[model samples]
Target: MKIVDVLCTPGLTGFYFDDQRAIKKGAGHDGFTYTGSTVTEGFTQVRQKGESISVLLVLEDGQVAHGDCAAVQYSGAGGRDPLFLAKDFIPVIEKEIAPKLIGREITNFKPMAEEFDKMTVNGNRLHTAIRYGITQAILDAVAKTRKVTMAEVIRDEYNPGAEINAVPVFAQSGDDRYDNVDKMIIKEADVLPHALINNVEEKLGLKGEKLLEYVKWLRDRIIKLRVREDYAPIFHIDVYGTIGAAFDVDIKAMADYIQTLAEAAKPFHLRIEGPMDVEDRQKQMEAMRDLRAELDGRGVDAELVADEWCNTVEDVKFFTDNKAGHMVQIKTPDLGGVNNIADAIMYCKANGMGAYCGGTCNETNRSAEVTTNIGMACGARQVLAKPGMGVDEGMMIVKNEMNRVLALVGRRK
Candidate 1:
């Protein structure tokens, strides 16, 4: 099956909510549990707060498989609103993009990506949500047109029967970073051997005394976790550039502090992630090499997982050239499009390195589903934690689907 055709649909729909107070007289202080709540809520606005949101649909061949090839909810600013007609940008994308992609072969995705790129005006929205929204639809178009599972597409694109391992993650939420960290340790005590903790000091505006206290508290908390669990596991802390900007913090100082923290971790293993400035690829490479060497000389085995630096294949080669990373944390979004993502993963293989793919929790089921196949092809030993968070949502779907596909590729039971 080939992408014989494509189509787009646009319309206004209103959603309503009903008052449950009348039906829930017996509902107690837990509050009224409402169902089928339909009320004239003055129509929800799709484009509020200067962000444009719209849906895109795709058709495979002539058959809308499973669901409109796929559906994408676009969100951004000033996307294709050339005439400044406001929320009417959907019509603009429909007119320009739909015509160019009507009969293109699904396998030729680059053309479609480029075609979509040609639609932006004033470059304000450029390609934030619009880019992703349309690209996702095209991917679904290709998968459906080929009549193949996204995992199967990945296998065909990469090695068959590949190995995959799930890596868990922890992020700070509300005012309970420490509390959340503790909960993750208890919940996933036996799930995996390592954890990735997101340390966003900028988000919390932590600096000087605040930052120091935060880091110290985090360090002590990890130490405490191991003692309580009576077991040790590897942990990686992602600073995301919050602490890397300190002019006073050089590699020697950072390495020494990390080593000191490592000692405190006792039987538990801990590693720091992306302590170098996010955009400073050169310095990041230098820091990782120095850190790796320092840790090695001390008989300490720590890994430097390169993230922002490996955005492109050239970036991958550069990281490898400088011994800048032990593992490649593949962010599929940075890959720009799906085909490039697959090619990048393959490139990592040719160079004798591991490649793992991940995205933020903002990912929908379709994108997560595709990562499972990518996960296998790379024989990656890592994935960002989401699916494991719950039995029925977001990353949970990723985990379940990946488990099913991995079983197909290898052993079962």
Candidate 2:
């Protein structure tokens, strides 16, 4: 089958775009928005409505396949793409991308995705958002043409020998870090309480006293509320580089503090993401590597996850090869194409590192569903429930997508 034409529509994403730079610089929360001036170059506010462009492909047989082009919540932070607005990006898709995609045969997904993902505008590749959505639509088009699930198409192309096993689902809590844990636990999230610890003074404490208490509380609460004795969910808290600030990014001090948190968790595993951001990719990697080494040397059980400065497949490989962290959050939007998500996850697993099929809360349902498909196909270590920090919605969206794919692909004769 061939794509007869292409269509684009501006749409609302699930969550708001948060300027991480501003938030890190002490932008206080004002109700549902931020209280201070924006610091990111493209942002007009510390927080604003997330935007998306839905790329629709018209197949020859009157079928339609679609995907959403959306940026991460922390746009323009941690070496990621700038704030992606539909108004600015929609025209580019219409003039540049639509022409190329029209009349293309929907054959194998890998090469077509790679080709469009690399297509450049003004000597630079299409923005990651465009590359991301275009590739998703291509995969969907190819999958529908073959009458199989998207995961099946991916497995047939990249990982044919792999079984269609379900990857674990992780849940994130936006600001309701305390109450939301109950929701996650009730639903039995594979990983729970992505306690968003963004500030040092307010959340993590100047001396780390605040977060220490919080984790202790979390440890107690889980044990208290879990309905079953076997409900052991991994505690993956995203400090957003606060822990590093609390200890001035000292390798020994950070390792020592994380050890304390690990002790507090006791039974559950703890993974800390983006512990520090030195504002440079190479330095970020080296710091994580050194910090992880320090933790291991001291027998700290906590896992360090690479987030800041680890955006692309290249960054994933760089951090993995250097042992910067125990896992890499393949932040789906940062990768130009979904193909890189597959590459990054498989590479991490192959190289003794964990692969998280994670994207931002500032995404569309379509985007979340598509990434879930790729994550299942790639056999990632864990798949993140995202597009909102709200525990229930994201959990349902991600888990449902995973189940649907498994149900369809598993029954293939």
Candidate 3:
């Protein structure tokens, strides 16, 4: 199959973009928006509507394969690409990306994705959002050309030796952590609430007591509310560095506190993400190694998942090499290309580390679908149900994609 034409359009994503720097600086929330001015360089407001550019590949068969280019909620933070606005990026795709993609033969996804993912304009690589969006379109284009689901295409090319299977789904709870946990339990998600604990004073508490109380409540709530007897969901909380802030980044104190949280969630395993963002990749990895070792030494059952300062494929490898955390999140958009998501997961699996195929809440349904296919195909430890913090919607999109892919794979046999 050959690309006959390329098209681009501006649209909205499922969630809004946020200024992580401003939020970390104590920007108060007011009526679903933040009260302070934006701190990130490209952000015009503390919180703004998330935007996306749909890149459509017109094939010789007249079937269009599409993907959405979108960034994370906290764009431009933790060494990520600048904020992605459709107004600024749509022109680049139309003028620069489309022309190169025109008439290219869709032989397979791997090499084509590598070529475009490395392409640059104006002396800098294409924005991660553009790279991410275009690569997804490429994968879909190949899959459409082959008359199979995207998951099948990846399994055929990327993981020829591995079995096609479903990845466990992890859901997040925005600020409505309490209510959303009920939804996740009702749905019986494989991984439960991603209680967003960004604020120390309000959410995490000065001494880490607030999060402790929340964990106890979460454990009890799961026991009390579960409809199925065998539904043992993993508690994955994203503290966003509040633990470090409260404990002053002391390894022993943080580890001891984490042990307490782990004990509180007894009879169920726990995984904590972004325990401490030390603001640099090397330092971040070192801190995680030490913290993880401390947890292991004490025979703690919890696992630490790295998020901040680990943005690229190389970062994933570095963290994996050092055993920085039990798992490393392949934040899909942060890696810029969908192929990288597959490679990162494969690397983690081969190296004795868990590959969390996680993206941000600020994404499109199309992005979520494409990444879910890649994650399921690659056999990641867990796949984040995303595009929004609302539990039901993201779970519907992600889990349904898995079911559809698994159904198609079974039929082909």
Q: In candidate 2, which residue ranges exceed 4 Å CA deviation?
A: 18-30, 34-46, 74-82
Candidate with better TM-score, 2 vs 3? 3
> How do the predictions measure up, each by TM-score?
0.63, 0.92, 0.94
Global Cα RMSD, each model = 9.9, 2.4, 2.0
C-alpha lDDT values of all predictions: 0.49, 0.88, 0.91
State the lDDT of candidate 1 residue by residue for 1-413, as single tens digits: 44444444432211112222322333223332233332222213322122223334445336552111111121221121121122454564566656666665567444565556445555643333345446656655555666655555555545555444443332312234556556555544322222223344443133323444455565566556655645444555565544455423466765665665566554555555665664467877777777667777777665566775666657877776666766676765444445555666677767766565555443345555655555655555455543223312543555566667656645431
TM-score of 2: 0.92
Worst 10 residues of 1 by lDDT: 66-75
Error of 2 at 342 (Å): 0.8
lDDT per residue for candidate 2 within 218-267, as digits (tens), equals 88888899899999989898889988888888888888889988988888
- Model 2 / residue 300 / CA error / Å: 3.4
Which candidate has the top score in lDDT?
A: 3
C-alpha lDDT of candidate 3 relative to the true structure:
0.91
